[PDB]
Amino acid sequence: MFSNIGIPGLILIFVIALIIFGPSKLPEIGRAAGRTLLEFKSATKSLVSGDE
């Protein structure tokens, strides 16, 4: 039924999101967040290090 579709069915749904969002919008967010997240781990390293 709707469970036997698996991923093949996901693409159809995903497209519904693309029309409203766009395939050039999801990658843009990841990249943008990518920079924000990148600095996150660096800040964390200082919390765990708690030393030189």
Curated annotation (Swiss-Prot):
Induction: Expressed under conditions of phosphate starvation.
Membrane topology value: Single-pass membrane protein
Cystine pairs: none
Coiled coil spans: none
Superkingdom classification of source: Bacteria
GO cellular component: cytosol; TAT protein transport complex
Localization of this protein: Cell membrane; Cytoplasm, Cytosol
BP terms from Gene Ontology: protein transport by the Tat complex
UniProt KW keywords: Cell membrane, Cytoplasm, Membrane, Protein transport, Translocation, Transmembrane, Transmembrane helix, Transport
One GO molecular-function entry: protein transmembrane transporter activity
Record-annotated membrane-spanning stretches: 1-21
Extra facts: B.subtilis possesses two minimal, substrate-specific, Tat translocases: TatAd-TatCd and TatAy-TatCy, each one composed of a TatA and a TatC protein. TatA is bifunctional and performs the function of both the TatA and TatB proteins of Gram-negative organisms.
Function comment: Part of the twin-arginine translocation (Tat) system that transports large folded proteins containing a characteristic twin-arginine motif in their signal peptide across membranes. TatA could form the protein-conducting channel of the Tat system. Required for PhoD secretion. The cytosolic fraction of TatAd binds the precursor of PhoD.
Family note: Belongs to the TatA/E family.
Subunit field text: Forms a complex with TatCd. Two types of complexes exist: one composed of TatAd and TatCd, and another composed only of TatAd. Soluble TatAd forms homomultimers bigger than 100 kDa. Soluble TatAd associates in homomultimeric micelle-like particles with a size of about 12 or 25 nm in diameter as well as in elongated particles of 12 nm in diameter.
Protein name, entry field: Sec-independent protein translocase protein TatAd
Organism of derivation: Bacillus subtilis (strain 168)
Taxon lineage: Bacteria, Bacillati, Bacillota, Bacilli, Bacillales
